[PDB]
Design a binder for this molecule. Sequence first.
Ligand SMILES: [K+]
Ligand SMILES: [K+]
Ligand SMILES: [K+]
Ligand SMILES: [K+]
Ligand SMILES: [K+]
Lengths: 368, 368
Amino acid sequence: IQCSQRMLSFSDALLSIIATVMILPVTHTEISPEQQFDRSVQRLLATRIAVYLMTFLIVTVAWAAHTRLFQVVGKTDDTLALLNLACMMTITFLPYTFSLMVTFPDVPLGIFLFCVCVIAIGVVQALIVGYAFHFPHLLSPQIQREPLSKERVEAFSDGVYAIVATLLILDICEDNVPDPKDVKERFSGSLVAALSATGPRFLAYFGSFATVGLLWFAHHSLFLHVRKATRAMGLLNTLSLAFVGGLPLAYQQTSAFARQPRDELERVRVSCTIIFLASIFQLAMWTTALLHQAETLQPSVWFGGREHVLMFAKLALYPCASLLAFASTCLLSRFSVGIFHLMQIAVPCAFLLLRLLVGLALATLRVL
Amino acid sequence: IQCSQRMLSFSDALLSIIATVMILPVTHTEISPEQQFDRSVQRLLATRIAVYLMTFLIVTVAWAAHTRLFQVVGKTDDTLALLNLACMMTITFLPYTFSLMVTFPDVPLGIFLFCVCVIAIGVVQALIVGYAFHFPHLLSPQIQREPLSKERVEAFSDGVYAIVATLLILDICEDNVPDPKDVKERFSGSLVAALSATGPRFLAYFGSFATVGLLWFAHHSLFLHVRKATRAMGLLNTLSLAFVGGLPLAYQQTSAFARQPRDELERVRVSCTIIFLASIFQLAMWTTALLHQAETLQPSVWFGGREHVLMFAKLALYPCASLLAFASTCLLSRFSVGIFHLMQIAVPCAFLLLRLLVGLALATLRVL
Ligand SMILES: [K+]
Ligand SMILES: [K+]
Ligand SMILES: [K+]
Ligand SMILES: [K+]
Ligand SMILES: [K+]
């Protein structure tokens, strides 16, 4: 009998990428200036965002069902591996059916194909269960004779984060790659001078990537001290990942969404809201785990623990900064863009010096 | 001190996706019929293919250096995690510099940025080494006082395979999603009738996905019996993955490459060549491991072992079928397309029945 760890890792990667794909249409929404005040186009954009959210949630539900199934199964086999590949294929077919239904919501074809795909997933998983139970040695020892699998959650989250960070660089690679017919005209053939138009732009990439990379760093930190992953924690993680997938929306440059008519205040508000939603659910995961620390958290991060305050600050850094920037957009709009840039530059430094800042604050409050 | 396994998994995912991204420009090659006989466009397409190969190899070299580094380090830390994030950011910046150099190969800007990025990677890794050695408890026990890390190779391969399988479905989602203004004209508003143009197309997806999914299944099988991963095996795996990344080229539909002028024989030959190159290097990995079976392979797959013939057949199935199809394109061109479709339908069945076919063949040869 074979060890199923790599097969489950492959499934996690596939499903995470599949869930995150549907943000691409959102980033490719073109709004002409003539349609800036057209409510129909704005409604279409909102509908496409809702479609992305629904598809992410559906793929996550399928992934959770798969996780249940292969917690029940445990071991794998050639036949089981091929059946898992068939299940992954059927699941990956879901975005196509959902897109077809979106294009023609009033025709039965989309609903019919979606139902057929769901039934196919069900039948494939039932076949997997039947094969596993027909050979008892392929079952988990407890079954051979609820909690979530932490590694599956971590792999799914890593896939989502990596895909977002990749979409950023794909956007950059197209933003600032001029052609000879463009450089010879805009800059009289001096490519170096094109830095004046491209220098800052790719520099902005460094700011965006960090925002994702540090968010993962928070997640990576939290689950280093997580013992038991509860279903509520899984749901909160799913919401956090769903809102993480929208970071390219607030950070991409070539994206049609980025080229829509807008103002600085609106863009800053949207980016701050997306970051706040992404991070507040990680903070909610941590708070939820704190209620049952005895069974969900390592002793170091329990109340009064050595790592407690550090973890709390690490997870609350982004929500507080995002909320402060959003408030500044309303109270100090004239300098809100500068404050947002300052936040982008400072939050990584705060993460780097976090262990010193926390101790300094603790000592200052103790003496005072 | 923290466990570095998840950080390395995240790095593997990032680097694998980054390596595979550069196939997207290749799939977006638009060749008008007026330029079918224009040698310049064909040369440009070949140059972009070579650029994709070079970028994949460079990203793989960076990933291998990172693997060496964090085999030396072993344990991780908050500062080490942030430094690893910085290193990943610098590495992800490589595609942008390579693309800029490609656009203007005769200007120093591209080479200058590429050199700056490489030096940045070097300095970041040197800082990681210095920090790790300044705190001896963050070093591996042997160092605290060559072989490859199998899990890193497996994670990188899984990332590449998942990205290819995802690119397939992204192509499909755009191939066969008509709009009302298109359905009302081409099919008089009968969306169901559009199956006549869309039915087979997404059906073809099922054929393409399997081809990737089974290739992974072969890889997944081989490394289940691999003890020690040698550097030569790593190089062969890198070549196999590089040629796997070109599967969307031979299987995508909307891709401008797919819409280029062509003939059935040429497309079949290209697809067969790509599949053959992808699988022959897995077979080469297996053969290379066989030379040092005592140190690289589990006893079950040694010469004369129970699983030996099964593994050999599993890894040689695709190369033989691809070579036979390619030969048919020259000897039986009139039926080569049908033979290719038959191969696409049959190879999964051969994989499913492999354990029976191998035994049947062995018995038949023994009695005869
Ligand atoms: K994993
Ligand atoms: K992944
Ligand atoms: K892994
Ligand atoms: K992956
Ligand atoms: K992509």
